[PDB]
Amino acid sequence: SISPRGLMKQRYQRVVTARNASKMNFKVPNYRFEPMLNRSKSGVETLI
Amino acid sequence: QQQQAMALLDYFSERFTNESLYTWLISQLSSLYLQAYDAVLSLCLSAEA
Amino acid sequence: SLLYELNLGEQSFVGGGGWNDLYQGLMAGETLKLALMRMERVYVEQNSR
Numbered sequence: 001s002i003s004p005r006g007l008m009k010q011r012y013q014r015v016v017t018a019r020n021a022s023k024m025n026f027k028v029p030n031y032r033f034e035p036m037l038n039r040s041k042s043g044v045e046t047l048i
Numbered sequence: 049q050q051q052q053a054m055a056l057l058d059y060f061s062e063r064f065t066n067e068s069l070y071t072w073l074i075s076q077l078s079s080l081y082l083q084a085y086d087a088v089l090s091l092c093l094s095a096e097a
Numbered sequence: 098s099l100l101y102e103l104n105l106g107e108q109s110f111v112g113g114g115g116w117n118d119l120y121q122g123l124m125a126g127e128t129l130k131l132a133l134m135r136m137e138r139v140y141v142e143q144n145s146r
Contacts, residue, residue, distance in 0.1 A: 026097040030145045036095040039141065043088035043134060047081070069120070076124045080131045087134050091141065 099136050103143055110135050 029036065100108070110132040115125040 024093055026093045028097060029094040029141065031141055033095065036091070036141075039137065040088070040092050040095045043084075043091060043137075046130065046134070047084050047088055072120060073124060077127060080124075080127055084131055084134060087131075087138055091138060094141075 099140060103140070105139070105143060108139075 031039075111129075112132075115128050116122040
């Protein structure tokens, strides 16, 4: 006597993508907005 | 044939470019990256203000 | 330069020993990048009128 073997089960897997966020504020710094923009963009690019 | 396979595994492991290298590199860069995130984020907050 | 220009007591970011042979100094510049970033932060922060 012989019997076949059942094919192994396969399934999808969920992936979470929810995200939280927090509010922030800070005091006025020494430097004008555009200098600050230049500085920040440089840093951001580096980080990326 | 078996012998060749096993030896090949060893030679591959002895490649200079190796798991260890990447591991080490990653650990360093990880620390740097996290610090950089904190740093630049503070400046960006200031920019919005 | 920064330290003299702002007389901010005694603080440091630059450090020796970044080179290594086993990793051929590969990550050094990245460490310098971060140190430079911290110095930049401090400058913007403290360069008040």
